[PDB]
Amino acid sequence: MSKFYKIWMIFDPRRVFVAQGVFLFLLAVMIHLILLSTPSYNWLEISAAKYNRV
Amino acid sequence: MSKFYKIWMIFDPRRVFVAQGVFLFLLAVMIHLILLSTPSYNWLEISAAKYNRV
Amino acid sequence: MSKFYKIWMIFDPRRVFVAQGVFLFLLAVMIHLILLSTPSYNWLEISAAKYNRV
Amino acid sequence: MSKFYKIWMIFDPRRVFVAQGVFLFLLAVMIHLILLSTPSYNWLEISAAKYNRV
Amino acid sequence: MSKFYKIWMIFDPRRVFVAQGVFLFLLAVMIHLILLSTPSYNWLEISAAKYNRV
Amino acid sequence: MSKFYKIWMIFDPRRVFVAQGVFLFLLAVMIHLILLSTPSYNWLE
Amino acid sequence: DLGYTGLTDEQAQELHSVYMSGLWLFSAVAIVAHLAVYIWRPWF
Amino acid sequence: DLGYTGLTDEQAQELHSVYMSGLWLFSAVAIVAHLAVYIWRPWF
Amino acid sequence: LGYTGLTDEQAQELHSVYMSGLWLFSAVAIVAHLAVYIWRPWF
Amino acid sequence: DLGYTGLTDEQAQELHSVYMSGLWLFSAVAIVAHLAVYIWRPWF
Amino acid sequence: ALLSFEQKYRVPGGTLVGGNLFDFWVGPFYVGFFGVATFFFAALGIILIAWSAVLQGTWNPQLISVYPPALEYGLGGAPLAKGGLWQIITICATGAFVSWALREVEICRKLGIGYHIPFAFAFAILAYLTLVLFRPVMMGAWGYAFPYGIWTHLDWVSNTGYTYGNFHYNPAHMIAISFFFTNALALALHGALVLSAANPEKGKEMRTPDHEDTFFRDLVGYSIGTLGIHRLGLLLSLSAVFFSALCMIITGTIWFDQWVDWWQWWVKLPWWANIPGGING
Amino acid sequence: AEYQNIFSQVQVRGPADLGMTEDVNLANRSGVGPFSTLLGWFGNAQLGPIYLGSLGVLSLFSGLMWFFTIGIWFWYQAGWNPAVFLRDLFFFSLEPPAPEYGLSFAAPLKEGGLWLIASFFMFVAVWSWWGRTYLRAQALGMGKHTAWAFLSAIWLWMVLGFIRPILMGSWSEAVPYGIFSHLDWTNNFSLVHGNLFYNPFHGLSIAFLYGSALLFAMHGATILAVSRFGGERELEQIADRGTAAERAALFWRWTMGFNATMEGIHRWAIWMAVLVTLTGGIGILLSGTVVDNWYVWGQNHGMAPL
Amino acid sequence: MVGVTAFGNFDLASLAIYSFWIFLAGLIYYLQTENMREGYPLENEDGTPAANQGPFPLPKPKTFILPHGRGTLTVPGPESEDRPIALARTAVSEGFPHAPTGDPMKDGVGPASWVARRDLPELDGHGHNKIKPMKAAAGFHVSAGKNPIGLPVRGCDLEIAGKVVDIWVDIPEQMARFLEVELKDGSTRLLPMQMVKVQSNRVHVNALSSDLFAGIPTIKSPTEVTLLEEDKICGYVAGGLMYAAPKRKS
Amino acid sequence: TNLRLWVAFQMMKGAGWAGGVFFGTLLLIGFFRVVGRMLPIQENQAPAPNITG
Ligand code: BCL
Ligand SMILES: CC[C@H]1c2cc3[nH]c4c(c3C)C(=O)[C@H](C(=O)OC)c4c3nc(cc4[nH]c(cc(n2)[C@@H]1C)c(C(C)=O)c4C)[C@@H](C)[C@@H]3CCC(=O)OC/C=C(\C)CCC[C@H](C)CCC[C@H](C)CCCC(C)C
Ligand SMILES: CC[C@H]1c2cc3[nH]c4c(c3C)C(=O)[C@H](C(=O)OC)c4c3nc(cc4[nH]c(cc(n2)[C@@H]1C)c(C(C)=O)c4C)[C@@H](C)[C@@H]3CCC(=O)OC/C=C(\C)CCC[C@H](C)CCC[C@H](C)CCCC(C)C
Ligand SMILES: CC(C)=CCC/C(C)=C/C=C/C(C)=C/C=C/C(C)=C/C=C/C=C(C)/C=C/C=C(\C)CC/C=C(\C)CCC=C(C)C
Ligand SMILES: CC(C)=CCC/C(C)=C/C=C/C(C)=C/C=C/C(C)=C/C=C\C=C(C)\C=C\C=C(/C)CC/C=C(\C)CCC=C(C)C
Ligand SMILES: CC(C)=CCC\C(C)=C/C=C\C(C)=C\C=C\C(C)=C\C=C\C=C(C)\C=C\C=C(/C)CC/C=C(\C)CCC=C(C)C
Ligand SMILES: CCCCCCCCCCCCO[C@@H]1O[C@H](CO)[C@@H](O[C@H]2O[C@H](CO)[C@@H](O)[C@H](O)[C@H]2O)[C@H](O)[C@H]1O
Ligand SMILES: CCCCCCCCCCCCO[C@@H]1O[C@H](CO)[C@@H](O[C@H]2O[C@H](CO)[C@@H](O)[C@H](O)[C@H]2O)[C@H](O)[C@H]1O
Ligand SMILES: CCCCCCCCCCCCO[C@@H]1O[C@H](CO)[C@@H](O[C@H]2O[C@H](CO)[C@@H](O)[C@H](O)[C@H]2O)[C@H](O)[C@H]1O
Ligand SMILES: CCCCCCCCCCCC[N+](C)(C)[O-]
Numbered sequence A, B, C, D, E: 001m002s003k004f005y006k007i008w009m010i011f012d013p014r015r016v017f018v019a020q021g022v023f024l025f026l027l028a029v030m031i032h033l034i035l036l037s038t039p040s041y042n043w044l045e046i047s048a049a050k051y052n053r054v
Numbered sequence F: 001m002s003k004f005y006k007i008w009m010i011f012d013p014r015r016v017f018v019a020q021g022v023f024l025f026l027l028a029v030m031i032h033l034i035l036l037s038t039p040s041y042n043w044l045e
Numbered sequence G, H, J: 001d002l003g004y005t006g007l008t009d010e011q012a013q014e015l016h017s018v019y020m021s022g023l024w025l026f027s028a029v030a031i032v033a034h035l036a037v038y039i040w041r042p043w044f
Numbered sequence I: 001l002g003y004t005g006l007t008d009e010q011a012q013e014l015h016s017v018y019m020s021g022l023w024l025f026s027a028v029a030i031v032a033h034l035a036v037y038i039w040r041p042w043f
Numbered sequence K: 001a002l003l004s005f006e007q008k009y010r011v012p013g014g015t016l017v018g019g020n021l022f023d024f025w026v027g028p029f030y031v032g033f034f035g036v037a038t039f040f041f042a043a044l045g046i047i048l049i050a051w052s053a054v055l056q057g058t059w060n061p062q063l064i065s066v067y068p069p070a071l072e073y074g075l076g077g078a079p080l081a082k083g084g085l086w087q088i089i090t091i092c093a094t095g096a097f098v099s100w101a102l103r104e105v106e107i108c109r110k111l112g113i114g115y116h117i118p119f120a121f122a123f124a125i126l127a128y129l130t131l132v133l134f135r136p137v138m139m140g141a142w143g144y145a146f147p148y149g150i151w152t153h154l155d156w157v158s159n160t161g162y163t164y165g166n167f168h169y170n171p172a173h174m175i176a177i178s179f180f181f182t183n184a185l186a187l188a189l190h191g192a193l194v195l196s197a198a199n200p201e202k203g204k205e206m207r208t209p210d211h212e213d214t215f216f217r218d219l220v221g222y223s224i225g226t227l228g229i230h231r232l233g234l235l236l237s238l239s240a241v242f243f244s245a246l247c248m249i250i251t252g253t254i255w256f257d258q259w260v261d262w263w264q265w266w267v268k269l270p271w272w273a274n275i276p277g278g279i280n281g
Numbered sequence L: 001a002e003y004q005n006i007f008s009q010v011q012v013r014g015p016a017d018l019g020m021t022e023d024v025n026l027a028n029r030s031g032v033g034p035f036s037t038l039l040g041w042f043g044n045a046q047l048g049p050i051y052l053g054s055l056g057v058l059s060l061f062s063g064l065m066w067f068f069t070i071g072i073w074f075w076y077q078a079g080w081n082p083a084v085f086l087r088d089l090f091f092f093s094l095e096p097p098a099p100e101y102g103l104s105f106a107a108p109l110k111e112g113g114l115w116l117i118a119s120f121f122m123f124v125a126v127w128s129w130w131g132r133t134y135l136r137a138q139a140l141g142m143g144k145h146t147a148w149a150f151l152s153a154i155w156l157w158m159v160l161g162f163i164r165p166i167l168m169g170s171w172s173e174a175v176p177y178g179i180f181s182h183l184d185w186t187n188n189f190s191l192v193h194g195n196l197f198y199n200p201f202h203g204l205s206i207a208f209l210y211g212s213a214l215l216f217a218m219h220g221a222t223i224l225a226v227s228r229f230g231g232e233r234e235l236e237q238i239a240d241r242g243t244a245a246e247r248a249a250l251f252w253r254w255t256m257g258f259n260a261t262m263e264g265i266h267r268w269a270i271w272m273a274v275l276v277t278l279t280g281g282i283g284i285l286l287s288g289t290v291v292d293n294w295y296v297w298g299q300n301h302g303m304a305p306l
Numbered sequence M: 001m002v003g004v005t006a007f008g009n010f011d012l013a014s015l016a017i018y019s020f021w022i023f024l025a026g027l028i029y030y031l032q033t034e035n036m037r038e039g040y041p042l043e044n045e046d047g048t049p050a051a052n053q054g055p056f057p058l059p060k061p062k063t064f065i066l067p068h069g070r071g072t073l074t075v076p077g078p079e080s081e082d083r084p085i086a087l088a089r090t091a092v093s094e095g096f097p098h099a100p101t102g103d104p105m106k107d108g109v110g111p112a113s114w115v116a117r118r119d120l121p122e123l124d125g126h127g128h129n130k131i132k133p134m135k136a137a138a139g140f141h142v143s144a145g146k147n148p149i150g151l152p153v154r155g156c157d158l159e160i161a162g163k164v165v166d167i168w169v170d171i172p173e174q175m176a177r178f179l180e181v182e183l184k185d186g187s188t189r190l191l192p193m194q195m196v197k198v199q200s201n202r203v204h205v206n207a208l209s210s211d212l213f214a215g216i217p218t219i220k221s222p223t224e225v226t227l228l229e230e231d232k233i234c235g236y237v238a239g240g241l242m243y244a245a246p247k248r249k250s
Numbered sequence N: 001t002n003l004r005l006w007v008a009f010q011m012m013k014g015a016g017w018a019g020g021v022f023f024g025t026l027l028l029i030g031f032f033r034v035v036g037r038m039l040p041i042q043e044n045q046a047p048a049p050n051i052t053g
């Protein structure tokens, strides 16, 4: 467990970092869009209902 | 059983690690989406019903 | 039955392992999805009915 | 955190800057369009209803 | 902030100026067309309705 | 602002003038078409 | 004295003077046409 | 000293000065246009 | 040795910086999740 | 030191310092804009 | 970044417009006058499609559709919410396609190769312009063109085809389909033959063009050759697109009825018009 | 003007090439046919020699009997009248059995039996030809890329004629043997199952057919554009890369940001072509068996408005 | 099986489409890596390896055995472009053109470039020379079209540069590859058929002017052309299209 | 004076090339329109293929 650093002796840091960032952004976008698609967690619609902006 | 490490003298560690990561991510995403598709396990819907949000 | 190991002097261990893993995963996914498609073995639906979730 | 500057010894400043600019512009455009698609945050529609322009 | 001029020691002025002019004209055309799409800010339609020309 | 002339020490004036003429003609035609599509400013009707 | 195109500082200054004279003349013609159209049919 | 483009420190400083002058003039014109439009039809 | 040409020390230092970034990202995500849960719990 | 882009430690430090100053400027402007929007129409 | 052999090929010249004003590369891409034009047109078109999605009320990529003006507008301008955005996006698409072709011409000139690729792309551009410009203008309305949606342009295809019954009976449609099918078959055969020559049974030497010629002579009795197959591919693709453009340009302009009824001219030829028997007797 | 290398300017003729021997049975290889100048303006003028083996004999007899069965049914349908035969040639059809017969072999000769006979002949002919494409490559020491690319088209052929009719429980689901009648079958197949446009695998098949035309126009144009450097000799450019391969790669790299090799372009080619029928067979197999209305399916899957 | 879903709307059609998406991702990865066997790894304009190598790793090396004892090729492998290139960069920044420092046609740069191919003739499947002069080729004759042998050859400056004396035919494909042109000084050059236009009374070469015909690289053996010589000749003639432009339509 | 005419000539070259392309496109479009008006299309006008009117 203390030897996880050796992952950088096996995989290329540049390609790993680019894949890491792209995956993180795509995952965050997917989660945000899933929350937006659900009526009970669409914060814009929730605020519109709360403040009577209809 | 104490001889499984020899898997790494048969298969490329890089390809095995990448394949395992991709397979695990796809499996997790598929299971999470299956759960979201079932009304009795969609946690967003369950919380909406529990707290009277929709 | 005590000379089955010689199958490894006929077939490549890498290709055999890859083919076996692919077949086993495809079979397992097939069976799980078939069981889900069967209303009498869909465990999520069975639990939903048992606990009156929906 | 004190060694984050070593990102520039791995990634070219030119590629990073161009990609970051493109990403920031596209993210801002996406967010602005998302807000415009919501009637409760479409500022043009809000102003039109506020000053009786329709 | 006093060292932003060093952007010119990384990026060639020719490409940067070409890209910046393209982006500026594209953004201006996009905003003008977005405003023309909206009935509340289409200045030609506003003039037509104001002076009873339509 | 008094040093804007140096734009001609970075971009070749001969090509810049041709491209600028293309831009001006295309922009004029686009604006004329937009006006022509509006009923209140269609001078051809 | 940063040059990518071979023009000297004096050549750039002279050419920019000519260019700006033409730009101001073109803008004046455009202003006159715009004022004529606005008198004919205002858009505000 | 990190010459990706071949400009010196002083050339880069002068180029940034002229570019920033152009940027500020463009932004000032845009600010005047926005203020005029907002007086004509506020969007807030 | 390895495949990428990084030394043992280089791999350790790169892992140190990467894990600092990971921990910062995780702390920010934990704070965001706690704020959302206080706002609207999903359980 | 040793890297893929041929940038020494000092060059990377200087470049990161200026990049972080630009990032903080952008973030400050974004924070002010978000505060203005939230006062105008809060989304929570 | 550059390929290992790229550096000796990156030389000034070969530009139709702009001289050295835009003669450079962004990453692997070559920029020119037409590269800058292509970028502007493509960016404006994509952004306007996103704005049309905002106006339409959906963010589903498969449900976004940009519709042309109604038939009532004829060939005139339409409001941006109705069909004006479609017209601007069509202008942007045409500009992007033509600038892409001209950028390819510039790259061909710089590399000292033939202009076969821009010429072959001009055929696709002409088919597109037939569908959006020539046929609607001939018919008198922008509303006869297709919408810019992933599944709604298929709706346009279905509606336009069924206006004339089964569209299979368009004869130029038949020729174009034959060309498309033959082209796919030839592409499969050519890829397979080159790969089989270059990748023999394991442990064997690379095969020569003699073996390729021998293999198709053994199979079908004829081999068209290494030059012949690439000429055949170019002509098959270009003929398919040409006959597609033709079958659509004749449809609704000189033929207005069910295409199945067209074939009655052969059946009703005077000598066998009235012989009893068969299908049509 | 400028020679575009589409038609040869000069034709040269020599002794006919008899082909490579390798491990080919030379007794089963015929003689060389005549030389075609008309064909030589575009490609090779030489016709033949052809290989005729055991599988070749089986395939020729089976296909000849298939054509003969269809043609004699057409002649019966014309009343043995040659003028009627020419008038209604595109209107004749050998139809499968009626749906009330299911998958049985009891349908009469004029009501489905003759179609079954012709279908058996076609089955034998096509599978014999596949075995022939495999064995002709094996004899020359070549890889079996042609055989497995032919199997992709055989997959769609089997689904259309054999597999889907069996899964649907009737031979009436299969395609008739006729010119206009198989077009009618195609139209009615689309109409019965909703809209085949809304079949995702029909869309994938169309994407790959369009991409085949795309890619092979691009490849033909590229090879003709660098043929001045001997680019049509693609095997020698794979073995020993020249300036033709480099210029061809750099054109596409400068155009669209990425390129191929003189070898890998043909991998792109083979895969783009086989995926047409590979996705088409799956799309047809899912029609009626899994989805009966593709437009409603697309509505439920975010492809059409609800 | 119609309407049978495991969950939500997921039926066999949905399973098939998602399976195909996974398969297509894998196939496109494989196809892109298969095409990185030439030109990689990427490098800077000074020849050193580039910091950015793209998202796809290099494929594991493969080996071709060459047909006629010609050796063995391993790709991807070390690169061979070590001949001097007479180009000087016109900018310190990357991505700008490199200008020739002499005569580009003679130095083989730009559209006049050539690759250091093997200095051996291409062989057919039987081990004989693939390209042979028609008179050296046994039984070969012109069968259709205008015979270019004996016709004068005109450059792009509308001047005669020589006359056609032979056709170099490709023996297996049975197609004309090169025209042998005799010059004023009595020496001969090879011109690709794709770069010439055979007319009724002349052969027109639009790429080269009449004075650039003597600069065409010469072959060692009068009855034999190598891949290297072919590459040099073709590169010279095609670079004529751009570097002989000031001598057109005269 | 020479410089003014040179600048004007370059700008007019660009503008004239753009205008030549634009009016050539209009000429082709007008040709297609003329061919469509001498055809019996008005008597045989096709239905709209889109859900929009
Ligand atoms: C109303 C009409 C229907 C429609 C219903 C059908 C049906 C039904 C099918 C298609 C299928 C296809 N359709 Mg559709 N299709 C429609 C509209 C379109 C449109 C369009 C712009 O409108 C396009 C371009 C297409 C295009 C296509 C192709 C992508 C695909 C055919 C692949 C192929 O090459 O088969 C040709 C190749 C074969 C059939 C295999 C051949 C192999 C065998 C072995 C050949 C043996 C030869 C034999 C022995 C003869 C020998 C003779 C001698 C050698 C001379 N469709 C609509 C909505 N379409 C097919 C598919 O698979 O998609 C799911 C299919 O089954
Ligand atoms: C003529 C023979 C075939 C052919 C040939 C061909 N295509 C070509 C070429 C050639 C020779 C190129 O050189 C060129 C290329 O570079 O390819 C990689 C190209 C090309 N053919 C392409 C696509 C393409 N070709 C098609 C067809 C065909 N191309 C023919 C069958 C199709 C079909 C049948 O649908 C498509 C989708 C591109 C990959 C490329 C041209 C890229 C291009 O134009 O780049 C500039 C423009 C953009 C980056 C996009 C602009 C977007 C617009 C501003 C907005 C959207 C408009 C659009 C109409 C919306 C559509 C909505 C719905 C209908 C989906
Ligand atoms: C990847 C999918 C694409 C594809 C691929 C493909 N097709 C293929 C192949 C491949 C890779 C082959 O290798 C194979 C082939 O041989 O190609 C040349 C083939 C083939 N694809 C063919 C056809 C074909 N492919 C089609 C489509 C496609 N093929 C797809 C687009 C279609 C369409 C669109 O409908 C057709 C019609 C054939 C040309 C060939 C397979 C031929 C075959 O099996 O023939 C069997 C013979 C018969 C059933 C009929 C014989 C009729 C004769 C009258 C027999 C009697 C002859 C007589 C005895 C002669 C006597 C002479 C003397 C008297 C002198
Ligand atoms: C010392 C040197 C030199 C190098 C060191 C290199 C380094 C550092 C490596 C990095 C170490 C790390 C992080 C390793 C992480 C490893 C991990 C997470 C392994 C995880 C494995 C998990 C596995 C198998 C799971 C398998 C699961 C399977 C089949 C499930 C199948 C399920 C099915 C089929 C059911 C399907 C059900 C439905 C459809 C409803
Ligand atoms: C003048 C003389 C003498 C002769 C003239 C001859 C003439 C005119 C011939 C005209 C021929 C024509 C029109 C042919 C048109 C054919 C067309 C379109 C076919 C289209 C699709 C066909 C398909 C998918 C067929 C698929 C069949 C498959 C998978 C397999 C079937 C196998 C079965 C059913 C076996 C059944 C039997 C047993 C098990 C014993
Ligand atoms: C007599 C005297 C004193 C002097 C002699 C002068 C003469 C004769 C010649 C001198 C030489 C010449 C020819 C010089 C010519 C110079 C010229 C034309 C300069 C012109 C510059 C024009 C410019 C920047 C125009 C920029 C315009 C822009 C961004 C507009 C953008 C509009 C947008 C983005 C919104 C568009 C609106 C909608 C979509 C609804
Ligand atoms: C005519 C009817 C409609 C047809 C299309 C014409 C629409 C109106 C003209 C749009 C053409 C683009 O307009 C032009 O675009 C190019 C990119 O293409 C950019 O042009 C330029 O901008 C800046 C301005 O200094 C230059 O420094 C830069 O080098 C250059 O790219 C700008 O965006 C705009 O000057
Ligand atoms: C080679 C590999 C072989 C194995 C391949 C396995 C692939 C598994 C992929 C599973 C992906 C599941 O993807 C998910 O499926 C569900 C099934 O209802 C879809 O469906 C969901 O959304 C739609 C649209 O709102 C709803 O109408 C539906 O009721 C809901 O369940 C989701 O839109 C989709 O995102
Ligand atoms: C069944 C179809 C098979 C696929 C297609 C096979 C090729 C079909 C024929 C294509 C047309 C070839 O037709 C042939 O073209 C060539 C080249 O233009 C002409 O050739 C003529 O003109 C060329 C060019 O000026 C001269 O160099 C040549 O000496 C002269 O004979 C022939 O006189 C003509 O008969
Ligand atoms: C200040 C007035 C400027 C007028 C500019 C006119 C631009 C177009 C010039 C050429 C027009 C003729 N044509 C047909 C070639 O386009």
Ligand SMILES: [Fe+3]
Residues within 6 Å of the ligand: K190, K194, K230, L219, L223, L234, L266
């Ligand atoms: Fe090829």
